[PDB]
Subunit: 169 residues, 6 copies
């Protein structure tokens, strides 16, 4: 069994993240999806809690027909020591074989620990990114179009737009 | 949507835990399953990591035909302040309505925070419990019979029996 | 018994803070006063320890004829998870009914937890603020005029001016 | 100004603690009263939160004719390093001169740091201990007689008896 | 360059520890010596601080003619997650090849991370151990005979005997 | 015995640091050398782990004819409370008499705790700084000339240049 790993803040989970996930699932048996910076919530850049993001991913991956047997969703708090972060991930996850990341630090930390590291198979443009999603939430743009409908439903239930607007005042 | 919550160490996940989960799913729409004491591993009482237990639950719940849309699996480290533990759970989980626990502390902490609390719908006997599973792993008893086959496969992959035997020497 | 809560760094406690406190005491029976960022000391923005600020508040509130039965003074360290901060405050304080804050994050965190939140009854201008107090301490301005005399006496005893001047070299 | 320091769990604050405090106030100008093991709540031995104990002390000291100018009340969480605990206390408190404790560890830690240390001036009777108070709360004995009435009122408001009884099931 | 690693509380450093270290230096180029449980001090089982033990080791290894080029002395605080402890050690130490330990948990943690692990080359009897050293310090036995003289000198300077006797009252 | 203390990030240890250390050793019997910000690694400003820097210092001091009896090397992680940092250092170090630092915060923290504080006896040339060393590692300049050869050997073994280059992409 070949297991990949992906790590991102996913503030919130959007269609781009999902496109990337589906591409990775073409080349691994199972994908471990880590929600990074799980300690951060209630800011403009990081509005949603770990739990809210777990909810987003769980609903979206189940809405899009990906069998439950092919993924794991794990929240991962940041830690002060970069030299321990890979060990931290490892403790919180199933065993894995390959890490997907475009980030130089994430790449180098995993490489130094002996893991195979590769760039994600797809890169999405800025206008589909979290920055754009959050800006549209703030400015009454079309944020819903950038998310799976299951994520929209989460954001509606948790009053996510109201939160981010209040925090920006 | 009515969401229940359950919390246990699940060292390891066994058939009893699963029986209880299925009973709860008769009376809630979705169940949030928290893996408690997620910081504890590599002892006789707590042999498996957070990640290994996430793997166990993920594989078992998917093996037994429970749709992914009906549950969430979340590791929860213990914390030094009992008065903060419910807040800690809340941050790490989707919103929920009702807590299932037989434990007086867990009950009282959740009750004081305004949640509905009830006992689990089923109680399994000691001979099906984690204590018995771990004893059988140590003593070459029939531990496999007490677990879903998907969990057995996890324990085989992570060399769980070898670990617990070494730790007991 | 109707209890309010206020939270601020109070670096140091000045006449503006006191004016606000007295206005709040017109509309609550008791006021819980939390010294925020209690972990921060010995910087230009945050010169004084938690203990020094406890001393400042204790002396000032006693000097100004407010009965001891009407307030509580509690140091509160910041924490990494915004989603837990209200729980953290709750553990450290008596039960309370209403929060007074002008800060959007503090407001939203408390409102999400179900508390009534309102702006402070008074807003003081910048020239009476901590920034101005600290600048005057550094530049040999009239910092004493901005503080209750009881706070001046604390600052003299702990060599606060000497400290901030050394730190700014 | 001569300042004493006292530290205790005060689970809960009882008439004994108050007798000792009054006795110390005959020998010092001001007393810093620290609530130790502030992180512990919701157990049989340590039922009450830091905030609940702050409330108990604040009410009791104000309702017994001790002027506010003569004391400070500070919650102090335990920490893993004994060699840092005096530094921890110091950060959280006004400057002080003398420590009152009968505990050999507390005495030695403070003595090593250069503080004068002395035993409490009074040893209260066996009836006034926290063990007895908590037993009576559990067994429907006369716990109220062992406490200042202001502390009784706190225990009523926070449902302290109901908590301890539930926890003991 | 072949580097070994050893880890122990060394409360205090005694002749037995030194005998073992010298035996290990027969089979490695350099030895990384970690002072475990570096957070623990001022108890009967763990009387000495991390710094005091660093001093003990530094002086003893220098007194006994072992060249400085052949060892490293590193204090290592315990951590709550066993699954991260090897990563923690790795961050704090030079790169190493082999671990020497008789402890089943230490062995298994390092073996799971891919290190070669072996028992120490020598086992000393109980009458030469830390337990015996500390008992003799308490009971006015011949503790000095169990230590290198350089360690005795550290213990005299830090008033170690006085400390342990006070703590035992 | 007169013991000095020095603290620095030493990212990496260079000929300047060694010049200063030798200069201090003219004025004290023994020098405690603390590696500050020990938690920081794998960034452009702080590339090396605590362990890698311990290795650098251990090798450099042993390869320059300083007797082992004259120094101690101790990693010190930063902590959130400035008011505890001196206590933190003290716990981790042998007893000391005098602190050498040009940093206003370090000076004031130690001075407040009653230590003698003095500036380092030498200020090394601009060429020997860590900023320059790291720039040269990145830009294929002559970084080796700025370091003791023993430190070069450490940087080669740990692939320090490859790390810093990858991190800068
Ligand atoms: N010491 C530690 O604790 C430590 C060390 C290393 C990393 N980490 C954590 O690891 C997590 C991941 O690190 P990261 O640097 O990747 O952070 P990140 O914030 O999750 O991602 C960085 C940026 O890349 C974007 N992105 C990701 N995949 C993309 C793709 N396939 N195509 C286009 N854009 C893409 C993200 O876009 P969106 O805005 O659309 O999401 C984001 O803007 C973080 O939570 C970080 O804190 C922690
Ligand atoms: N401050 C804090 O951090 C804090 C506060 C409260 C609770 N917690 C955590 O919350 C988690 C859960 O607490 P817990 O007391 O329930 O611990 P637990 O160790 O998960 O469960 C206690 C015992 O009950 C058994 N059990 C559970 N459900 C049962 C059922 N339906 N029928 C029969 N036996 C059953 C378990 O059996 P098995 O051996 O078969 O699993 C175990 O022996 C723990 O990880 C605990 O540490 C943390
Ligand atoms: N995750 C967490 O730990 C967390 C989350 C939320 C908040 N907090 C903490 O909560 C504390 C309070 O938050 P805060 O944002 O209010 O910080 P703050 O540092 O206390 O100050 C807010 C700003 O508003 C000013 N101010 C306050 N009341 C005023 C009034 N009535 N009129 C005019 N100006 C007024 C203060 O002035 P002065 O300079 O005169 O004081 C300061 O400049 C902080 O310590 C923060 O760190 C922590
Ligand atoms: N590293 C650390 O974090 C660290 C290090 C040292 C100490 N501490 C903390 O410091 C606190 C102080 O320790 P402690 O053991 O004294 O706390 P404690 O829980 O108050 O224990 C003292 C015991 O003696 C009793 N007592 C105290 N003063 C008395 C008097 N004058 N007459 C008669 N009986 C008296 C108390 O009775 P009652 O039951 O009636 O109260 C209690 O049973 C603890 O919270 C401890 O954890 C922490
Ligand atoms: N999660 C974590 O933080 C974690 C995980 C694993 C281990 N650790 C730490 O790692 C450290 C070392 O673990 P440990 O179990 O070896 O603890 P330890 O306290 O150093 O002692 C192990 C026992 O074996 C004895 N001993 C050691 N070497 C011996 C020899 N060659 N012959 C005879 N007796 C010998 C020691 O005797 P003496 O009394 O003479 O010293 C002690 O009684 C501890 O500080 C532990 O806390 C931490
Ligand atoms: N609360 C806390 O945790 C706390 C509080 C206070 C301090 N600290 C820690 O203490 C450490 C010490 O602070 P620091 O700013 O001095 O560290 P630092 O990173 O070594 O900064 C000193 C700067 O001055 C240079 N320098 C030092 N001594 C010199 C000399 N004799 N001649 C010429 N240049 C010299 C260094 O050069 P190079 O680049 O060549 O090294 C560096 O650029 C830090 O790690 C800090 O975080 C922590």
């Amino acid at each position: 069994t070949m297991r990949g790993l992906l790590v991102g803040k996913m503030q919130p989970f959007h269609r781009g993240h999902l496109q990337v996930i589906k591409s990775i699932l073409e080349e691994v048996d199972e994908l471990i999806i880590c929600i990074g910076s799980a300690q951060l919530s209630h800011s403009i850049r990081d509005p949603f809690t770990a739990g809210e993001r777990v909810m987003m991913l769980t609903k979206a991956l189940s809405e899009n027909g990906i069998p439950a047997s092919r993924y794991y969703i794990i929240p991962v708090q940041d830690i002060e020591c970069n030299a321990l972060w890979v060990g931290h991930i490892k403790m919180l996850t199933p065993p894995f074989d390959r890490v997907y990341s475009g980030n130089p630090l994430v790449q180098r930390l995993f490489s130094e620990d002996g893991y195979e590291v590769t760039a994600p198979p797809l890169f999405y443009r800025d206008r589909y990114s979290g920055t754009e999603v959050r800006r549209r939430m703030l400015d009454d743009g079309d944020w819903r179009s950038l998310l799976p409908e299951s994520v929209v439903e989460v954001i509606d239930e948790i009053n996510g737009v109201e939160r981010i607007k209040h925090l920006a005042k």
